[PDB]
Each structure stands twice: as structure tokens, then as C-alpha cells.
Amino acid sequence: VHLTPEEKSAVTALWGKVNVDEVGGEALGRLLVVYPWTQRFFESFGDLSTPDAVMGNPKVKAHGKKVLGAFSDGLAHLDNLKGTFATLSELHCDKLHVDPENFRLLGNVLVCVLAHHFGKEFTPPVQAAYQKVVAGVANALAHKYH
Amino acid sequence: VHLTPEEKSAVTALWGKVNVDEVGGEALGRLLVVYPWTQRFFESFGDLSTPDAVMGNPKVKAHGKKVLGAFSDGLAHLDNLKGTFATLSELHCDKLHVDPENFRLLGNVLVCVLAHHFGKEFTPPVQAAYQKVVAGVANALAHKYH
Amino acid sequence: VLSPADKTNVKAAWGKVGAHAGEYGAEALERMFLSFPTTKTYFPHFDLSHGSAQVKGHGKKVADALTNAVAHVDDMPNALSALSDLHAHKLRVDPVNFKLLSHCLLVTLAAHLPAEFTPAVHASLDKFLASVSTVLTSKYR
Amino acid sequence: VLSPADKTNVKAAWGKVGAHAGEYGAEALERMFLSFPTTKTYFPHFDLSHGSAQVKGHGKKVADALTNAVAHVDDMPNALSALSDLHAHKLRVDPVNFKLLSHCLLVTLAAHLPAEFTPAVHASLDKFLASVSTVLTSKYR
Ligand code: HEM
Ligand code: HEM
Ligand code: HEM
Ligand code: HEM
């Protein structure tokens, strides 16, 4: 099962209610800084060493917007997660072979940057709901191994 | 998604092809011995300290047969896992509050005792398939938290 | 196991935390139980509902224990050995829930200090909380 | 960090392992890649199919490194510090996959020695492999 319809509506409503622009790119920069060995997967991006060049990297902010749009699709079409996360799941499993706790690190650092960008607009129900939706995203994105 | 129909058939076929009796009770004894702090959840069983009294415990071998029958139901009705794991999931979440890596420990020690009880009847495809079915069992048994 | 630069950064940010240590520990346990409900077996006699006073009290206690770990920054297993004993033997707590509470505390710290929570001090404090969990898993009785 | 009794037990069982060390490391990597396919990024140039000879060779190498850790039983981080350096810095390997391979090796050891794999020696060898993963996560460069 999953959450309440009211709390899943709160999930998509407050994710629409973020400042929709750079939260993904800042989450990428935060992930790569606070865990510096995740960029073994991201060596092809070039600018991955210093945080300032990370924020200036068009590849980093483009990957942030790409993850942001993927989250937008996965939360708009929240009913069928495993239908929406199909090509991304195939890529992450077969081509990328990402170790499945890196999705744990990324989901938790996204939770940290959303807490940073809200403060008083981040109810701990909204935090637990967001932890659940990114756990469901990480499961639907790591299932073709299995 | 899930496995091949042929490999899920191999899962239920070889689980029917185990010596069906005491593999669950031996897995319980092995779990409680190789991890001695899981029995914080199992303090009510009495005989939980020495392995010999564990194997002699009617509560331990009864819980082994109960887990064995639950696995029998969850692998016979393998299509609807979350329908079969309903009362057990409610118990494990609400009443028991089992930390979700203890299901990881139990699934992996069951894999160890099935490897012990087969040897040459344990193909590493069958091992990976069994790891997947006990990960699905552990997910369907830890989902009412979420 | 840090630089003097980011050690200076975390002691300055922890001074900015300051007398909100009890409040931040209260909200850390609040978000802890609301987020990872497997952990409520370890606090059964409390009233597991919205904003409990004993939850706030124990959050104050745990937060100031982490302030003691801050004040003994390079001596962290020496400082936390008694609690490692208590947790791994007395209460028998699974040793990655310390990492769970550590990241939850980082979420509430970023929620409460967003005009200071740079990714640099974020990385420093994440390594610090990794270390606190690391010295509570070395179950030195 | 063991008793002399179960240390004697694991060195006797490891002598029973013996010259099947290369074979057991081969099957351990076989079951490793077949079971946790996230790990095949760390061995890309190999032929990730049924029974590869270089997989068997590297399994022999890793198994005998664990035999060196057996021969240096109480000196395990001292023995494995160079590999900890290699893995955490050169190859940049996530540090719980050592626990993954440790349990997979226990599965193949129980598969191959079922007339010796008592729960007692099982618990001893599980604590041992926990220790090997523990000293490979302390990334002492
Ligand atoms: C948790 C949710 C995640 C989402 C929604 C996501 C989504 C995406 C997207 C949209 C792309 C771009 C595909 C393309 O442009 O063709 C991508 C590629 C990639 N992802 Fe992620 N990803 C996630 C997690 C991760 C994690 C945790 C890692 C760990 C390092 C990772 C590593 C990569 C890499 C290396 C690429 C290739 C870069 C590229 O194609 O430009 N992803 N992923
Ligand atoms: C992985 C598959 C598991 C299955 C299929 C399973 C199944 C069961 C079953 C059939 C019962 C008996 C319910 C009753 O008789 O009313 C039970 C109870 C219980 N389970 Fe498990 N369980 C699993 C995992 C675990 C784990 C990992 C733990 C960790 C300690 C655990 C702890 C308990 C406890 C403490 C009880 C209560 C004892 C009792 O009711 O007699 N279970 N579970
Ligand atoms: C991460 C760093 C942590 C620190 C510094 C810490 C600190 C403390 C301290 C100082 C006490 C003693 C309170 C007293 O005097 O009664 C305590 C008790 C306790 N801790 Fe924590 N703790 C930490 C993490 C955790 C976690 C994650 C749990 C998970 C549930 C936990 C469970 C407990 C429990 C059950 C008690 C006993 C509470 C009581 O009996 O009143 N601790 N802890
Ligand atoms: C658990 C104990 C482990 C031990 C004792 C061990 C031992 C070793 C040794 C001795 C080498 C050097 C081989 C050479 O001389 O080229 C090596 C290399 C390597 N290890 Fe392991 N290893 C362990 C676990 C792992 C795990 C779980 C992985 C996960 C994928 C891993 C990944 C690698 C890789 C990628 C190499 C480089 C292989 C090459 O370049 O040929 N190791 N390991």
C-alpha cells in the first residue's frame, strides 16, 4: 500500500509549491560534495571537483533540471511509478549499474535541500511523506536488477 | 517487475523440493546464534540462550514451522504477495516494530541454511532468485510503516 | 579527523545552534519517530503522538551528549564509549539507526539554519555525524 | 577479537577449506555477480557470463588475501590496511559490499562444507567476516 490520498496530494502540492528552479541542481552539488565518491559514476561531467565549478557546470545544473523533471513526472503520475520510471530504470540498472544506496544518499540529500529551502514550510509529516516517495522512486528505479 | 515465470516456477518447485520439515527452525536457531541481539524481539520465547535449548524449544521449532508455512503461502500465492502478507505485515509493523534489517538478516540466514541443506541442489541462479523472493517478502512484510 | 578550518566552522555553527540545542534535539526526535517508525519500540512508555514533553526532554539529553562530543571533537570514541556500552549492551540498539538519527538531525539543522547551511559546513557536519555513528558502532564495553 | 576456542575452530575449518581456496573464491565471485548485479561495474572488462576464467583468477586472489587475513587473525586491520587504501581510494568501492561478499562467501562455504558448518563455526566465521569488512571500511590511507 501507500499513503493517504490527502498526503499524496500534499506531496504533489508542496512539490509544486517549491521554488521550482534550482533545488535539484543544489541537491546534486550537495550530494557530490558531502559524498565525494559518488562522482565515480559522474566522472564524465567534467566540472565535479570544486563546489563553485559544480554550480557553474551546465552539465550539473542540466542534470539537476533533468532529475527535477523526472521527479515532476514521477509525482504527477504518482499512481503508476513503475510505468513512468521505465527508461530511467533501464539506464540506471543496465548501463549505469548504480549501487542502490546511492539513491538513498540522493533521496536524503534532496530531503535536506528541501528542508533548507523551506524551513517553516516543511512539516515533519511532509518530511516522512517525502522520505516515502523518494524510497518508492528509488525502488522503482532499482528493480531491473531483480 | 519480477523474474521469469520459469524461474519463479523454479523458486516454488525447489522450495517444494526442500526437505520441508526443520529448515525454518534451523534458520531461526542460526539467526539467533549468529546475531545474538535479534532476540530482544524474542525475549518472550524463554529458550533463546543456548543453541541446544533453542533446537529443543517447542516455541522455536513452532515459530520455525509458522515462518515455514507463511513462506509456503507466500510462494504458492506468489502473484499477490501484498495480499498474502497482510496480517503478518500488520503484526510486524504495528505490534512488533521490527527494524527492517532484521528481515535482511533472516532472509540471508535462510539462504545460508538452504545452501547448507542442498549443496549441489543449489544453483546460483536459484540463489539469486531466492534472494529476490525473500527481498520481496521482506518488502511486503515491511510496508505498513510507509 | 577533521581540518582545523572546518573544525572552526563546525564550532562556530554549533555556537550558532547554541541554546537551541534542546529545541533541536526535540524536533530531531519528533521527525525521527514520525519518519522511521521502527524506532518507537525503543521508547514505548512515551506517548507517541504530537509533541510530547518527555520526547523533548530526551531530545535535549541526546543533543547535549552530542555537544559533549563536539567539545571532545578529536576524542570522539573516548567521549562516547560509555554510551556505546549503554546502547549496544543495555538497550541493544541496531547500530545504523545512529546514522538514521544523524541524517535526521542534519535535516532539522538545515531546516533551522538555512542562512548558514552551506554545502561546505554540510559536508563537514555530515562527516562528523558519520564519526559519531562510527564510534557508537565500535561496541567497546 | 575472538576466543582461542573458536579461533582454533576457524583455523581447523579453514584448513578443511585448504587448497579449495581458489575454487571457493571463484564460486564466491560467481554468486556475487549473479546475485548483486550492481557490482559488475567494478569489473567491466571481464566477460560477465557463465564461468569466466579471469573471474576465477581474481576470486583466487581475493580468497588468498582472506587467507592472509586468517594467518594474521588478531592483526586484521594491520594486514588489510593496504587493501583498505586500494579499495577506498583507488577503486572507490562502497564499503558495505564487503559485507555483501562476506555473506555470499558464507553461503558458498556452507554450500561446500555442510558436514562441518555448525551454527557455532557459522557464528564465529560470520563475526570474522564482519571484522574483515570492518577493517576495510576504516579507510586508513
Ligand atoms: C533518485 C532519482 C534519480 C533520478 C530521477 C535520476 C534521473 C536521471 C536522469 C533524468 C538522467 C539523464 C538521462 C539522460 O539525459 O539521457 C540520469 C542520468 C544519470 N544518472 Fe541519474 N537519477 C537519479 C539517481 C541517480 C543517482 C543516485 C546516481 C548516482 C551517481 C545517478 C547517476 C546518473 C548518471 C551517471 C547519469 C548519466 C549522466 C547523463 O546521462 O547525463 N542517478 N539520471
Ligand atoms: C522474513 C519472514 C518472516 C515471516 C514469514 C514471519 C512470520 C511470522 C509468523 C508466522 C509469526 C507467528 C504469528 C502468530 O503465531 O500469531 C510471527 C511472529 C513473530 N515474528 Fe516473525 N516473521 C518473519 C520475520 C521476522 C523477523 C525478521 C523477526 C525479527 C526478530 C520476527 C519476529 C517475530 C516475533 C517477535 C513474533 C512474535 C512471536 C509469536 O507471535 O509467537 N519475524 N512472524
Ligand atoms: C546519535 C547519537 C546518540 C546520542 C549522542 C545518544 C545519547 C543518549 C544518552 C546521553 C542517553 C542517556 C539518557 C539518560 O540518561 O537516560 C541515551 C539513552 C537512550 N538512547 Fe540515545 N543517543 C543517540 C542515538 C540513539 C538512537 C538513534 C536511538 C534509537 C532509538 C537511541 C536510543 C536510546 C534509548 C532507547 C535510550 C534510553 C532512554 C531512556 O531509557 O530514557 N539513541 N541516548
Ligand atoms: C571482502 C574482502 C575482499 C578482499 C580480501 C579483496 C581483495 C582484493 C585484492 C587482494 C585485490 C588485488 C588484486 C590484484 O592484485 O589485482 C583486489 C582487487 C579488487 N577488488 Fe577486492 N577484495 C575484497 C572485496 C571486494 C569487493 C566486495 C569488491 C566489490 C566489487 C572488490 C573489488 C575489487 C576490485 C574492483 C579490484 C580490482 C581488480 C583488478 O583491477 O583486477 N573487492 N581485491
Author numbering:
A (entry chain B), B (entry chain D): 1 to 146
C (entry chain A), D (entry chain C): 1 to 141
Reproduce text from the manuscript describing this model.
The two-dimensional (2D) classification of hemoglobin particles showed a rich distribution of orientations (inset) that enabled a final reconstruction to be obtained at a resolution of 3.5 Å. At this resolution the side chains and bound heme molecule could be clearly identified.
To verify the imaging quality enabled by UFG support, we prepared cryo-EM specimens using 64 kDa hemoglobin, 67 kDa α-fetoprotein and 52 kDa streptavidin applied to the UFG and collected cryo-EM datasets for single-particle 3D reconstruction. All of these three samples of small molecular weight were mono-dispersed on the UFG with high contrast.
